[PDB]
Design an enzyme around this catalytic site. Structure first.
Site, short mmCIF file in Angstrom:
data_model
loop_
_atom_site.label_atom_id
_atom_site.label_comp_id
_atom_site.label_asym_id
_atom_site.label_seq_id
_atom_site.Cartn_x
_atom_site.Cartn_y
_atom_site.Cartn_z
N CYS A 180 0.78 -1.28 0.11
CA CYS A 180 0.05 0.04 0.01
C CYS A 180 0.81 1.22 0.03
O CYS A 180 0.40 2.36 -0.45
CB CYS A 180 -0.88 0.10 1.23
SG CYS A 180 -0.31 -0.37 2.83
N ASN A 189 -8.52 3.85 -2.55
CA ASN A 189 -7.74 2.66 -1.78
C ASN A 189 -7.02 2.05 -2.98
O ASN A 189 -6.84 2.45 -3.93
CB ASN A 189 -9.00 2.03 -1.19
CG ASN A 189 -8.44 1.04 0.10
OD1 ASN A 189 -7.20 0.66 0.06
ND2 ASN A 189 -9.24 1.05 0.98
N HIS A 205 -2.10 1.98 7.18
CA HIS A 205 -2.70 1.92 5.51
C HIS A 205 -2.32 3.40 4.73
O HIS A 205 -2.91 4.14 5.14
CB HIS A 205 -3.90 1.44 5.34
CG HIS A 205 -4.37 1.08 3.93
ND1 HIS A 205 -3.88 0.20 3.20
CD2 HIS A 205 -5.49 1.78 3.23
CE1 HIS A 205 -4.26 0.21 1.92
NE2 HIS A 205 -5.43 1.02 1.93
#
Length: 317
Positions: free
Chosen positions: A92, A282, A262
């Site tokens: 990520c 995302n 994240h």
């Protein structure tokens, strides 16, 4: 299910309580049939550790919009509307880096060259500098690395686009149980300084470099300013179990425990029902939350969304 108990994704008691609690959003299961080690392998950004220079937007006379979608401001840059997926890899950190870089290239190269910067390359050729590969990493070095070594181009897994397209397959966490729960297990792939056969230019002739790497201040308006005159930015926020369940509206942490850190790509803002929010992209595919994007409470440094805004300008010519 032939296997043992425990770690069954999340309990409906959750989904439903998040809902009976009547807050800025509403939740529902996004992941179906998954080992919980996967649900935590997604959150693979560290939080803490480094931090580039500084960027202080001189406030003054520029009146930013009451809302904004970085995708609309620049329709010419398709990269902005892209939602990536990282498979069972804690990359990520590298995705927000590249997804934000990708845009900025198209943004600042006039609206000329739009190019899918490779997460594959950042992920596998950066090393201990950036952190730990598929098991966590630092977004700061992520950009630092683009400026130092530079990144080639690589689209989505099996997309056949560019030098090095991501080699990890997405997990079918989306919606099925004919296969088993795509556990987060995985190994960081190797640094292969080589473009896909048939592809031209050469890997070395594909590296796009950056200008510099800076940190954006911990003030919402400065960020609204960075996104507004430069392009989307990479952030960092803490993930709690309830967030996994986001379907729509403006997120607010309610319960659950820390799944971890994240990174993401903030690319806008607006106020939905009197709740200012940040429009964030995302890296869990297009079947997650709302077509892959989501909203989190802005202005109250929620879960650290307003703390870690790393970013930078691309190298013109």
């Amino acid at each position: 299910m032939r296997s043992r108990p425990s770690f069954h994704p999340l309990s409906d008691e959750l989904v439903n309580y998040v809902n009976k609690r009547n807050t800025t959003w509403q939740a529902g299961h996004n992941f179906y049939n998954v080992d919980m080690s996967y649900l935590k392998r997604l959150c693979g950004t560290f939080l803490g550790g480094p931090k580039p220079p500084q960027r202080v937007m001189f406030t003054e006379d520029l009146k930013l919009p009451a809302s904004f979608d970085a995708r609309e401001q620049w329709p010419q840059c398709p990269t902005i509307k892209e939602i990536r997926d990282q498979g069972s890899c804690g990359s990520c950190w590298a995705f927000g880096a590249v997804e934000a870089i990708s845009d900025r290239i198209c943004i600042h190269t006039n609206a000329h060259v739009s190019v899918e910067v490779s997460a594959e390359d950042l992920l596998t050729c950066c090393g201990s500098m950036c952190g730990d590969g598929c098991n966590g990493g630092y977004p700061a070095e992520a950009w630092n690395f683009w400026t130092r070594k530079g990144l080639v181009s690589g689209g989505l897994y099996e997309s056949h686009v560019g030098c090095r397209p991501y080699s990890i397959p997405p997990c079918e966490h989306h919606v099925n149980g004919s296969r088993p729960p795509c556990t987060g297990e995985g190994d960081t792939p190797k640094c292969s300084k080589i473009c896909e056969p048939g592809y031209s230019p050469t890997y070395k002739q594909d590296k796009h470099y950056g200008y510099n790497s800076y940190s954006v201040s911990n003030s919402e308006k400065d960020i609204m300013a960075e996104i507004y005159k430069n392009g989307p930015v990479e952030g960092a926020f803490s993930v709690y179990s309830d967030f996994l369940l986001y379907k729509s509206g403006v997120y607010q942490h309610v319960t659950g425990e820390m799944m971890g850190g994240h990174a993401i790509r903030i690319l806008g803002w607006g106020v939905e029902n009197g709740t200012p929010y940040w429009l964030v992209a995302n890296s869990w595919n297009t079947d997650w939350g709302d077509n892959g994007f989501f909203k989190i409470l802005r202005g109250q440094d929620h879960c650290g969304i307003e703390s870690e805004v790393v970013a930078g300008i691309p190298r013109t010519d």
